[PDB]
Amino acid sequence: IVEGSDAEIGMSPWQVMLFRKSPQELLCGASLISDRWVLTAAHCLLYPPWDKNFTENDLLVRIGKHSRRYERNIEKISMLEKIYIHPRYNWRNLDRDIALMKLKPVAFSDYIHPVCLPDRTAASLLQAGYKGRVTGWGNLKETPSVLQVVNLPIVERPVCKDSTRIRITDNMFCAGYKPDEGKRGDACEGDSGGPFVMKSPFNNRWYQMGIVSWGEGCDRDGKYGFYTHVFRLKKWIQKVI
C-alpha cells in the first residue's frame, strides 16, 4: 500500500492472505466473512491472458496474521473445499471481479473475526467524500513486514470515468484523493482482493463495501483505485451461500 501505515494488532481480524502451495507464494489478500467463507478478487484465481487458473487444490489461506514472523498460537492455516468465481466475470474491465472460497471452520479469536456484508448501510455509506479503509501486504511503492492500512475517500462516478479509458461499469467504484486534495494513498500490486471497509455510525459495525480490483499505476495524480461494488453482487453471494 502506498502512503499507508502500520496496522495495530487485531485492527483487521477479518484480514486473510491467499497463498499458493508450490511455489509457496503470497498471491492476494482476502476477507473472512464467516467461519467457513472467504471473499477475494476474481483475478487472483482466474485470469486467462496470464495463463492464471488456480483451483482449491493449488491454494491455501492463512488467517490472523500481523507480520509476514510465525505468529505462534495466533495465526491459522486452512485448505479450500471449493472456489466460486462469478459466472459473468468480465476478465477481458474486470467487471464483476469477485469470488468466494469455501474452507473446515476456523476458530474465532481476538485476531480472527468476520466482517459484515452491506445491507440496503450501502445507501448511506456510499457517498463521495466518505472515507473507507484499505488493508494489505502489497507493494509499498509502484516500482512490508507488517500489515498496512490506509483510509481513502470515495470518488464520484463522473470523476472516476474521466480519470480512465477503461469502460467503467456500475458494478464498481473508485476511491482516492484528488491531485489537489493534499493527502496521498492507494492500494498497489499484491493488495488485490484486499477489503475496503467502512464503520457504520448506526450500529458500530464494520462493513466490507468493496474489494481491491484494479488501478492504473499506484498513487498517481489523476488516477484512482477501482474496487468491486460488493453490495450490488450480494445477491450472488447470498445464492452461493
Binding site: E8, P13, D110, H113, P114, Y130, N151, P153, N204
Partner: peptide
C-alpha cells in the same frame, strides 16, 4: 452474528488511531 465487532477494539470499548477519520467523513 457478531460480525464487524472487533474483539480487541469494539468489544473492549476501544478505538484505533485512524478510526475517527472515517466517522468524521460521514458527518
Amino acid at each position: 452474528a457478531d460480525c464487524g465487532l472487533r474483539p480487541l477494539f469494539e468489544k473492549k470499548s476501544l478505538e484505533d488511531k485512524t478510526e475517527r477519520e472515517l466517522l468524521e467523513s460521514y458527518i
